[PDB]
Amino acid sequence: MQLVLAAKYIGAGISTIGLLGAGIGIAIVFAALINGVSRNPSIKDTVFPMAILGFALSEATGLFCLMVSFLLLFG
Amino acid sequence: QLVLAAKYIGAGISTIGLLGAGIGIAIVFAALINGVSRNPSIKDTVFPMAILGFALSEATGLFCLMVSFLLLFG
Amino acid sequence: MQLVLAAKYIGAGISTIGLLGAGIGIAIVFAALINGVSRNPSIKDTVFPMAILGFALSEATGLFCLMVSFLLL
Amino acid sequence: MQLVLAAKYIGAGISTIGLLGAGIGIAIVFAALINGVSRNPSIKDTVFPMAILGFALSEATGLFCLMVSFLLLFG
Amino acid sequence: QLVLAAKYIGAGISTIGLLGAGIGIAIVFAALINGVSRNPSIKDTVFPMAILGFALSEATGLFCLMVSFLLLFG
Amino acid sequence: LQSTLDNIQSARPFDELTVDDLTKIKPEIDAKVEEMVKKGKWDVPGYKDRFGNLNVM
Amino acid sequence: KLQFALPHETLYSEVTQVNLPAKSGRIGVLANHVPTVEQLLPGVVEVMEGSNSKKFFISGGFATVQPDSQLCVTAIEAPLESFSENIKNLLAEAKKNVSSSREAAEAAIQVEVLENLQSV
Amino acid sequence: DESILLLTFLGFTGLVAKYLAPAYKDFADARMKKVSDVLNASRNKHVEAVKD
Amino acid sequence: ISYAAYLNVAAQAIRSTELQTASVLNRSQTDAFYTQYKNASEPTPITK
Amino acid sequence: LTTFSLYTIIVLLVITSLYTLTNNNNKIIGSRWLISQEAIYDTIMNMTKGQIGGKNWGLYFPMIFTLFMFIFIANLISMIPYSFALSAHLVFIISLSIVIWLGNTILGLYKHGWVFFSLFVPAGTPLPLVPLLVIIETLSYFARAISLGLRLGSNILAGHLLMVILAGLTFNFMLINLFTLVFGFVPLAMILAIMMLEFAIGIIQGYVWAILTASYLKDAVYLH
Amino acid sequence: MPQLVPFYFMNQLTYGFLLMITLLILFSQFFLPMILRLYVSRLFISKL
Amino acid sequence: MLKRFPTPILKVYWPFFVAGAAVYYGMSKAADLSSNT
Amino acid sequence: DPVSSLSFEPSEKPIFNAKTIEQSPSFGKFEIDTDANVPRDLFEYTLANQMLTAMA
């Protein structure tokens, strides 16, 4: 009993690790956005929605990690 | 029992694999933004190239996720 | 009891790790801001709103990790 | 044996970790492609064979990792 | 006594969370030195912004430290 | 032509009018729509040169 | 189009591939390229229009791909073959004398050109 | 539990009505104007041809 | 030394032998003496 | 009859009104609501003309448009705090994806015979690693079967599960000591920020669906 | 879990796939060509 | 209001329809297999 | 400027400073360097290039 509950909690912790990579990923996209906009002065009107797409996709990987963490934590 | 505990643990370990894919996707999109901002004009050719690169980057993460699920459900 | 509570304490420690990614993340956004502004000068007025947005999203990932720590506690 | 069967499932999980590296790797090749082609759009045709070679090799390291996971799972 | 043992283990693990913020801090200040050396004169505008980013990144590390202390004190 | 000027002047739907009435005065509307459906296309060429179009890429 | 020019002679008036040595190392331009500005360093330059390739020794200058795809190359003087052994020997002697001797900057150029020449 | 979530949703629809709804009104207006202007231009255009 | 002067010295070096024509050599001649001025007052017209 | 069945009916009735009660009688000018679904029409027109780009780009435009709108409406319905998603059954979203993947393979075989498999050698590469480049292309090709569905399902499911957990957490926050009642606005504001984010990732996912099954059809309709 | 094991999969899939074929036909034949009519009507007036 | 036009959906959506039927059948067996556990 | 072979019109032109080159609006479409002081180089180069032409 105790072991099964414990195991679930440990495993959830391991799953939390996955999220860090998505976090850094998001930052990288935003860094590129800033650098691009400073580079062009004018790419922004096209590029800004593109940047939002990239953000979401990077984020989605982190979402998968989180949901697996919840599946182990809550059951 | 021990085996069932081991399933829950095993799944957690597999979840670590996803982090690399997350970084990977970002790198493709960063490159898209840099390429687009640098030329302007390359953008229409490059947008499908970027989508392809995204798909492949995501795929390695997905394999990690499916292995995680396989251990989780059993 | 003892074992389950033990696992919880351990799990909490593990959860701090997720936050580390956010720590690097926040820095990257601000680094980009500083580079952009120093390069352009005057990009700043458009860019400063963008910087706040990027910060918030980066921070949010760390918050999720943090809340998992709290759940384990 | 509960202990042995557990060990297989644990060990399988551990194997899975390697694959993250290949994931980053694929993106790195693609990034170079985007920047390169941006710098000279006519280099694209020369580069595209080189690119497919690079994709495959980076992916292959991931494949080997995933194989070891499956070997622990099913043998 | 397993619970008391576990507290001490948990504390050890918690230090790992801080490391990323430490790297982060360096990255902000690196950008400052690079930018300032490129522009010369940008510095007075940029410096409030830089300090803001520096603090925000640090605050994440503080959270990790806080969870360590929270375990230690209970 | 004088009668025609007055008729064109008094037949200005410059406000608004049903597209069904435009189908009624010209079955060319439905004909082109049907031919476009037959091609599969939903792009109308010339439409975009004096009416907008949202896009992303 | 490719403008390859000297004050008194315009050698070329886009030309398929051009390979140029710039204060950026060496850059090759083929068809469309992003519209650069590059300082040309003293150089051995190859210009290819179709498969035909022509080899130039160039005194440095400026290179600028225009956003209208005109590769403006401006340089003070250039062919490789006309510049090309006794001349190198003489240049070595002159380099040496100047080496001992603004005279420092002159000697730096003498060494640079002598090496670049020595390459051919 | 979920009534807190309902407070969040009410705030969200409030935020939409504050910020987005005048912008979307303006967007819709802008497009209508352009269509109408094209239409009345076309009306003028054919009337010109009669005079010619 | 100025960038175009740097290139100039290089051009002169390229004009260093018998494998080349007179017109280059003529382009490698210098006449003028830059007539320094001040105030009206003229510091000496030192050779260019 | 099931909850899921009731929400499929609700979706049918919503989508019909956006193409009916959205413009009275249908005039040239076009009523303010139909301008929205016009701009959407165009941004998917220029996207799948921007992808598949055949003479049959518009021939697969109804499928790609009703794949947009389905996900676009069902991630507004799923954002209502007392509504149970169709995507909460992942198996339906994944089933739609597998259907599309199979409808790509059958289309690919139909359209390109036994040289459909020439898709899995993208380019000539050194001959002893041409077979390697078939294996981890086909592996990635039938990764397309589950990737497209599981992305959308997981994002929506995880977002709602996150929100419900945070709502539950702020419930128990209002059950700790009275110092939490003061300055307890900050966790409510956090749920608001996440609630804004889940709409963004739901509309983006409808576009991501429709770009990915435009990319897969770009491959499937025209070989390589 | 937020429900992840029904046994109602085939029930679900029947109503699900029916809704897809319904919307596909409904769009394709009805709602899309009346939009193409708006485009064409505006352009036919524009063209004359 | 509405005016229908019969847009091609015949052999156009033949691989799409075939896939739907196959999955419909396969999910029947899957539903039966899942109602056993 | 020798306007025609029978005329000459005295003519002038403005030499563009390196500061100008920096702040030129389509400066952003000429880019590859920032570690080379291309304004400070190009200014010098065109100081002479313009001057020679004017003299000729």
Neighbours, chain K (3 or more CB pairs < 8 A): A, F, H, J, L
Alpha-carbon distance values, M18 to A35, M24, M35 (Å)? 24, 10, 15
Q: How far apart are CA K30 and CA J205, in angstroms?
A: 26
Alpha-carbon distance values, C62 to E51, H41, J154 (Å)? 20, 56, 19
CA J193, distance to chain mean position in Å, is 22
Q: Does B55 touch chain A (CB under 8 A)?
A: no
| Nearest residue on chain H to J192, alpha-carbon basis | H8
Residue J1, classed as helix, strand or coil, is coil
The domain made up of G1-84 is a member of CATH 2.60.15.10: yes
Nominal resolution (angstroms): 4.6
The answer to whether the Cβ–Cβ distance between J154 and A63 falls below 8 Å is yes
Neighbours, chain L (3 or more CB pairs < 8 A): F, J, K
* F6 to chain L, closest Cα gap in Å: 31
DSSP state for residue J130 in the 8-state scheme: T
The answer to whether the Cβ–Cβ distance between C31 and E31 falls below 8 Å is yes
Residues 6+ apart with CB under 8 A from E29: E50, E54
- Domain ranges in chain I are 1-48
Residue M33, classed as helix, strand or coil, is coil
CA A51, distance to chain mean position in Å, is 15
E strands within chain G?
2-5, 10-12, 17-22, 25-30, 37-40, 43-49, 52-58, 61-65, 71-75
CA M2, distance to chain mean position in Å, is 20
Q: Does J182 touch chain H (CB under 8 A)?
A: no
Residues 6+ apart with CB under 8 A from B31: A32, B50, B53, D30, D31, D32, D34, D35
Q: Are E69 and E10 in contact (CB under 8 A)?
A: no
Token pair, residue J36, equals 């929205």
Chain D residues closer than 8 Å to J139 by CB: 63
Q: How far apart are CA E67 and CA A16, in angstroms?
A: 15
Q: Does J68 touch chain F (CB under 8 A)?
A: no
**DSSP letter string, J87-147:** SSSHHHHHHHHHHHHHHHHHHHHHHHTTSGGGGGS-S---GGGTTHHHHHHHHHHSSHHHH
Locate tokens 């593109």: which residue? A50
Locate tokens 């990732």: which residue? J201
Count how many pairs of residues, chain A against chain F, have C-beta atoms within 8 Å.
3
| Nearest residue on chain K to J26, alpha-carbon basis | K38
The answer to whether the Cβ–Cβ distance between B28 and D27 falls below 8 Å is yes
CATH number at residue B24: 1.20.20.10
The answer to whether the Cβ–Cβ distance between K41 and F19 falls below 8 Å is yes
DSSP state for residue J83 in the 8-state scheme: -
Locate tokens 């165009």: which residue? J42
Beta-carbon count within 10 A of A48 CB: 14
Token pair, residue E24, equals 């982060």
- Structure determined via: cryo-EM
Q: Does M44 touch chain G (CB under 8 A)?
A: no
Q: How far apart are CA F36 and CA J40, in angstroms?
A: 19
Chain B residues closer than 8 Å to F57 by CB: 43-44, 47
Q: What are phi and psi of A41, to 5 degrees?
A: 50, -5
CA-based nearest residue to G12, from G24, G20, G4:
G4
Q: Are A50 and B32 in contact (CB under 8 A)?
A: yes
Token pair, residue E1, equals 């006594």
Q: How far apart are CA E26 and CA E30, in angstroms?
A: 6
Q: How many residues belong to chain I?
A: 48
| Nearest residue on chain C to J163, alpha-carbon basis | C64
Count how many pairs of residues, chain F against chain J, have C-beta atoms within 8 Å.
57
| Nearest residue on chain J to F47, alpha-carbon basis | J42
**DSSP letter string, J26-75:** -BSS--TTHHHHHHHHHHHHHHHTTTT-SSSTGGGHHHHHHHHHHHHHHH
Q: Does F44 touch chain J (CB under 8 A)?
A: no
Measured between its terminal Cα atoms, the distance across chain G in Å is 28
Measured between its terminal Cα atoms, the distance across chain H in Å is 75
Chain D residues closer than 8 Å to G33 by CB: 39-40
Buried b (16+ CB within 10 A) or exposed e, M17-52: ebeebeeeeeebbbebbeebebbebbbbbbbbbeee
β-sheet bridge partners, residue J159: none
Token pair, residue A33, equals 């956005």
Q: How far apart are CA J119 and CA J141, in angstroms?
A: 10
Q: Are J202 and J78 in contact (CB under 8 A)?
A: yes
Locate tokens 């996207």: which residue? J47
Query: SS3 for C15-64, per residue?
Result: HHHHHHHHHHHHHHHHHHHHHHHHHCCCCHHHHHHHHHHHHHHHHHHHHH
Q: Are C2 and E2 in contact (CB under 8 A)?
A: yes
Q: How far apart are CA J127 and CA J199, in angstroms?
A: 48
Domain count, chain K: 1
Q: Which fold does the domain I1-48 belong to in CATH?
A: Atp Synthase Epsilon Chain; Chain: I; (1.10.1620)
Q: How far apart are CA J153 and CA J89, in angstroms?
A: 8
Counting CB pairs under 8 A, whether chains E and H reach 3 or more, is no
Write the residue in D52, D59, D60 that is nearest to J123 by C-beta.
Answer: D52
Alpha-carbon distance values, G51 to C15, G46, G56, G78, J88 (Å)? 62, 12, 16, 22, 62
Neighbours, chain J (3 or more CB pairs < 8 A): A, B, C, D, F, H, K, L
Q: Are J38 and J29 in contact (CB under 8 A)?
A: no
Alpha-carbon distance values, H10 to B21, H4, J79 (Å)? 36, 10, 12
Residues 6+ apart with CB under 8 A from M48: I4
Alpha-carbon distance values, C73 to C12, E3, J77 (Å)? 6, 13, 34
Question: Is residue H27 classed exposed, middle or buried when 0-12, 13-18 and 19+ CB atoms within 10 A define those classes?
Answer: middle
How many alpha carbons lie under 13 Å from residue G48 in its C-beta half-sphere? 13
Locate tokens 């709290």: which residue? C70
Per the structure, the complete domain to which residue B61 belongs is given by 1-74
Locate tokens 């980009």: which residue? C32
Per the structure, the complete domain to which residue F48 belongs is given by 5-57
Task: Provide the pairing of β-strand G52-58 with G10-12.
Answer: unpaired
Chain J residues contacting K via beta carbons under 8 Å:
2, 4-5, 8, 11-12, 15-16, 19-20, 26, 28, 30, 34, 37-38, 41, 62-63, 65-66, 69-70, 86, 88-92, 95-96, 99, 157, 160-161, 164
Note which residues in 9-28 of chain M have CB less than 8 A from chain I: none
Query: SS3 for D14-50, per residue?
Result: HHHCCHHHHHHHHHHHHHHHHHHHHHCCCCHHHHHHH
Please state at what angle helix G86-100 crosses helix G103-118, rounded to 10 degrees: 150
